[PDB]
Coordinates of C-alpha atoms and ligand atoms in Angstrom, one line a residue:
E1 CA -3.1 7.9 7.9
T2 CA -0.5 6.6 5.3
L3 CA 0.3 8.9 2.3
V4 CA 1.8 7.5 -0.7
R5 CA 2.7 8.3 -4.3
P6 CA 1.8 5.7 -6.6
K7 CA 4.5 4.8 -9.1
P8 CA 3.5 5.4 -12.8
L9 CA 1.6 2.0 -13.7
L10 CA -0.2 1.9 -10.4
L11 CA -1.0 5.6 -11.2
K12 CA -2.5 4.5 -14.5
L13 CA -4.4 1.7 -12.9
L14 CA -6.0 4.1 -10.3
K15 CA -6.8 6.8 -12.8
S16 CA -8.6 4.1 -15.1
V17 CA -11.3 3.7 -12.2
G18 CA -11.8 7.4 -11.6
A19 CA -8.8 8.6 -9.2
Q20 CA -8.1 12.2 -9.5
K21 CA -4.8 13.0 -7.6
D22 CA -1.3 12.5 -7.5
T23 CA -0.8 11.5 -3.7
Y24 CA -3.3 9.3 -2.0
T25 CA -3.9 7.8 1.5
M26 CA -3.6 3.9 1.7
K27 CA -7.2 3.7 2.4
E28 CA -7.8 5.4 -1.0
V29 CA -5.4 3.1 -2.9
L30 CA -7.3 0.1 -1.5
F31 CA -10.5 1.6 -2.5
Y32 CA -9.3 2.1 -6.1
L33 CA -7.9 -1.4 -6.3
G34 CA -10.9 -3.0 -5.1
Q35 CA -13.3 -1.1 -7.8
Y36 CA -10.7 -2.0 -10.4
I37 CA -11.0 -5.6 -9.6
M38 CA -14.7 -5.4 -9.3
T39 CA -15.2 -3.5 -12.6
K40 CA -12.8 -5.8 -14.7
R41 CA -14.3 -9.1 -13.1
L42 CA -10.9 -10.2 -11.9
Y43 CA -12.4 -12.1 -8.9
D44 CA -13.5 -15.6 -9.0
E45 CA -17.3 -15.5 -9.1
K46 CA -17.6 -18.9 -7.5
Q47 CA -14.9 -18.0 -4.8
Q48 CA -14.8 -14.4 -4.4
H49 CA -11.6 -14.6 -2.1
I50 CA -9.6 -15.4 -5.1
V51 CA -8.3 -12.8 -7.7
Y52 CA -7.2 -14.1 -11.0
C53 CA -4.8 -11.6 -12.6
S54 CA -2.4 -13.4 -15.2
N55 CA -3.6 -11.7 -18.2
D56 CA -3.9 -8.1 -16.5
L57 CA -1.9 -5.1 -15.5
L58 CA -2.5 -6.1 -11.9
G59 CA -0.7 -9.2 -12.4
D60 CA 2.4 -7.1 -13.8
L61 CA 2.3 -4.7 -10.9
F62 CA 1.8 -7.6 -8.2
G63 CA 4.3 -10.0 -10.1
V64 CA 1.7 -12.9 -9.4
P65 CA -0.9 -14.7 -11.7
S66 CA -3.5 -14.8 -8.9
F67 CA -3.9 -14.3 -5.1
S68 CA -6.1 -14.8 -2.1
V69 CA -7.6 -11.8 -0.4
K70 CA -6.8 -13.6 2.9
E71 CA -3.2 -13.1 2.3
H72 CA -3.3 -9.6 3.9
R73 CA 0.5 -9.1 4.4
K74 CA 1.5 -10.5 1.0
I75 CA -1.0 -8.1 -0.9
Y76 CA 0.4 -5.0 1.3
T77 CA 3.8 -6.0 0.2
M78 CA 2.9 -6.2 -3.3
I79 CA 1.0 -3.0 -3.2
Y80 CA 4.0 -1.2 -1.3
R81 CA 6.4 -2.1 -4.2
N82 CA 4.4 0.2 -6.3
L83 CA 4.4 3.3 -4.4
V84 CA 6.6 5.6 -2.4
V85 CA 5.5 6.6 1.1
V86 CA 5.6 10.5 1.9
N87 CA 4.9 12.5 5.0
Ligands
LIG1 C1 -17.8 -8.9 -6.4 C2 -17.6 -8.9 -4.8 O1 -18.6 -8.4 -4.2 N1 -16.5 -9.3 -4.0 C3 -15.4 -9.6 -5.0 C4 -14.0 -8.8 -5.0 C5 -12.7 -9.3 -4.6 C6 -11.7 -8.7 -4.4 C7 -11.6 -7.2 -4.9 C8 -12.9 -6.7 -5.2 C9 -14.2 -7.5 -5.0 C10 -16.5 -8.9 -2.7 C11 -16.4 -10.3 -2.1 C12 -15.4 -8.1 -2.1 O2 -14.4 -8.4 -1.8 N2 -15.4 -6.8 -2.5 C13 -16.5 -6.2 -3.0 C14 -14.3 -5.9 -1.9 C15 -14.2 -4.4 -2.3 C16 -14.2 -6.1 -0.6 O3 -15.1 -5.7 0.3 N3 -12.9 -6.3 0.0 C17 -11.5 -6.9 -0.8 C18 -10.9 -5.6 -1.3 C19 -11.0 -4.3 -1.0 N4 -10.0 -3.5 -1.8 C20 -9.2 -4.6 -2.3 C21 -7.8 -4.6 -2.8 C22 -7.2 -5.6 -3.2 CL1 -5.6 -5.4 -4.2 C23 -7.7 -6.7 -3.2 C24 -9.0 -6.9 -2.5 C25 -9.5 -5.9 -2.1 C26 -12.7 -6.6 1.5 C27 -12.9 -8.1 2.0 C28 -11.3 -6.1 1.9 O4 -10.4 -6.7 2.3 N5 -11.5 -4.6 2.3 C29 -12.5 -3.8 2.2 C30 -10.1 -4.2 2.5 C31 -10.0 -2.6 2.5 C32 -9.8 -4.5 4.2 O5 -10.7 -4.3 4.9 N6 -8.5 -4.5 4.6 C33 -7.5 -4.6 3.5 C34 -7.2 -6.1 3.0 C35 -6.3 -6.1 1.7 C36 -7.0 -5.2 0.6 C37 -4.9 -5.6 1.9 C38 -5.9 -7.5 1.1 C39 -8.3 -5.1 6.0 C40 -6.8 -5.5 6.3 C41 -8.4 -3.7 6.7 O6 -7.9 -2.7 6.2
LIG2 CL1 -4.5 5.4 5.1
LIG3 CL1 5.6 1.6 -12.3
LIG4 CL1 -5.9 0.2 -17.7
LIG5 CL1 -8.8 10.5 -6.0
LIG6 CL1 -12.6 -0.6 0.0
LIG7 CL1 -1.3 -12.5 6.2
LIG8 CL1 8.5 3.7 0.4

């Protein structure tokens, strides 16, 4: 497990979909990010590997207008900018 403390804006995003903690496992961060994308319908209905976020907090956090879920390394990099790893 990787324990992480989200920075304030990522924390706000996580709490908007029901998160309760100040530190998380990475698995939990990915869970809540997926739930956020689903509930706000940011994914492309006609190609559900694509996420559009140019008009959303997520686009500010990741620094991109859109991304493909297949870009695993890049998405991890975007998430890790928004947290600090703790032990
Ligand atoms: C509506 C619907 O039904 N949609 C659309 C949708 C798209 C995007 C987000 C939500 C919905 C399906 C097609 C879907 O995609 N749904 C329902 C998510 C829940 C999912 O099932 N996802 C995507 C996902 C989960 N959390 C995310 C957070 C972000 Cl920021 C972006 C995408 C996701 C699978 C394919 C996935 O990638 N999962 C389960 C992670 C945990 C994982 O397995 N890995 C990690 C990959 C990555 C997240 C680092 C890119 C590997 C390395 C291992 O670990
Ligand atoms: Cl983890
Ligand atoms: Cl922040
Ligand atoms: Cl929000
Ligand atoms: Cl939680
Ligand atoms: Cl998940
Ligand atoms: Cl990759
Ligand atoms: Cl770190």
